[PDB]
Amino acid sequence: LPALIDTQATAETRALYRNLAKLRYKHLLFGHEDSLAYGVHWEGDMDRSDVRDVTGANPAVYGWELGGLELGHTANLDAVNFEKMQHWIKAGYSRGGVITISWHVFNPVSGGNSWDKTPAVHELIPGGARHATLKAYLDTFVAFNEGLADVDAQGNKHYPPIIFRPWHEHNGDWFWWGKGHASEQDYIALWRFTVHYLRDEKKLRNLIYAYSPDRSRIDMANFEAGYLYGYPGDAYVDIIGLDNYWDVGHEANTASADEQKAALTASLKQLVQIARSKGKIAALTATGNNRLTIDNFWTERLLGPISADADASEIAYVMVWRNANLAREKSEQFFAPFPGQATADDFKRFYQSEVVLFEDELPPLYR
């Protein structure tokens, strides 16, 4: 019933969207960022994941990150080599997994990173002095995407579908495309251009577009209004996403565990209600408890509140963030366990849940 904004999307892309729409009622796909690139205690293996090391299975959804690609870097902002990333994307896809991509775009004005709040959006949008830069930036993704293609025996090109999730958490003020640094109208212009350019000018047919405000800057008393701040329109969005680290034990959140559980459920319920009204699909596009310090985090703080409400449960997937390599990054940051980590057994329970799907129990999503 939901239809993609790309009316000409590849058969595999259309199939993915249709199958997510069917599966969402009774199941939840589990995703992990940079899952094959490294783990907390390893890097270099060509086919490994902390998630698999714990459960025996790969995540169903593989998140990847392009920041730095736009600058012609060999590797992204977390030192993930782009060539390796292309191979890892193809490998996951070949096993039936789902691919999603974010993009912490560097600041073109200062040459700083996404957290450099020097204004840039007004300059990047059509009519802006730096509009050529936006095109050049997006062109690098067009090229990256070509490195994902195969050609069949008949000479037809095929690609992994990609859930493309740009310009995320835009209701926050921490990125240069965020509130306080870009007008709402200019953000909308940026979004609409991104879609026109990739879908219409460049004729990419393997993309599903995900919109992803941050829950931590939405007023729960007025959720829909907060959610739709900077919303570019139904003709520009396929997935009604949400980044919510807030209700899952964010260190700055003083709300009680029980209050947080209720808020997580309420946030996903309202997310799903918005998706329903718009004929889209909802998802929890980023979440997790950094360093997994919460007892039974997976069953008690994530799955329980999702499953508590039949609307909230209608999200198609949930993705947790990356397992930063300690030897390399100097500070513990991780959102999935690794063997011996305190929540590993509870993560096995999460995996074992009939509702939750990892790679190993996905139906064929691409037909």
Ligand X SMILES: OC[C@H]1O[C@@H](O[C@H]2[C@H](O)[C@H](O)[C@H](O)O[C@@H]2CO)[C@@H](O)[C@@H](O)[C@@H]1O
Site residues for ligand X per CB under 6 A = 65, 77-78, 104, 169, 243, 245, 286, 321-322, 333
Q: Are the CB atoms for 145 and 159 separated by under 8 Å? A: yes
CA gap 285, 201 in Å, rounded: 27
Residue 169 binding partner per list Na ion, ligand X, none, with a CB distance cut-off of 5 to 8 Å that depends on partner kind: ligand X
Burial class (CB in 10 A: 0-12, 13-18, 19+), 119: middle
Q: Which is nearer to ligand X, 70 or 243 (CB)?
A: 243
Q: Which is nearer to ligand X, 111 or 126 (CB)?
A: 111
Per CB under 5 A, contacts with Na ion among 305-364 are 353, 356
Residue 77 binding partner per list ligand X, Na ion, none, with a CB distance cut-off of 5 to 8 Å that depends on partner kind: ligand X
Nearest residue to Na ion by CB is: 356
CB of 16 to Na ion, least distance (A): 20
Residue 321 binding partner per list ligand X, Na ion, none, with a CB distance cut-off of 5 to 8 Å that depends on partner kind: ligand X
CB of 354 to Na ion, least distance (A): 6
Residue 104 binding partner per list ligand X, Na ion, none, with a CB distance cut-off of 5 to 8 Å that depends on partner kind: ligand X
Task: Please name every residue paired with 98 in a beta bridge, in sequence order, or none if there are none.
Answer: 61
Nearest residue to ligand X by CB is: 286
CA gap 79, 92 in Å, rounded: 20
- What is the rounded end-to-end Cα distance, in angstroms, of the chain? 16
CB of 240 to Na ion, least distance (A): 24
Q: Which residue, chain included where needed, has tokens 């493309």?
A: 164
Say which amino acid occupies 129: A
Q: Where are the beta strands (DSSP E) in the chain?
A: 28-33, 61-65, 98-102, 150-151, 157-158, 162-165, 207-211, 239-243, 281-287, 317-320, 356-357
Q: Which is nearer to ligand X, 319 or 365 (CB)?
A: 319
Strands 61-65 and 162-165 come out as unpaired
Q: How many residues bind Na ion (CB under 5 A)?
A: 2
CB of 104 to ligand X, least distance (A): 5
CB of 367 to ligand X, least distance (A): 31
Residue 65 binding partner per list ligand X, Na ion, none, with a CB distance cut-off of 5 to 8 Å that depends on partner kind: ligand X
CB of 78 to ligand X, least distance (A): 5
CB of 169 to ligand X, least distance (A): 6
What Cα–Cα distance (Å) separates residue 349 from each residue in 27, 98, 133, 146, 300? 15, 22, 47, 39, 11
Q: Which is nearer to Na ion, 208 or 356 (CB)?
A: 356
Q: Which residue, chain included where needed, has tokens 């807030």?
A: 246
Q: Are the CB atoms for 272 and 282 separated by under 8 Å? A: yes
What Cα–Cα distance (Å) separates residue 116 from each residue in 88, 132, 178? 30, 21, 11
Q: Which is nearer to ligand X, 28 or 286 (CB)?
A: 286
Residue 141 binding partner per list ligand X, Na ion, none, with a CB distance cut-off of 5 to 8 Å that depends on partner kind: none
Residue 356 binding partner per list Na ion, ligand X, none, with a CB distance cut-off of 5 to 8 Å that depends on partner kind: Na ion
Q: Which is nearer to Na ion, 198 or 356 (CB)?
A: 356
Q: Which is nearer to Na ion, 257 or 355 (CB)?
A: 355
Structure tokens at 330: 């100097």
DSSP letter assigned to residue 278:
H
Q: Which is nearer to ligand X, 74 or 277 (CB)?
A: 74
Structure tokens at 115: 């957290």
CB of 233 to ligand X, least distance (A): 23
Residue ranges in contact with Na ion by CB under 5 A: 353, 356
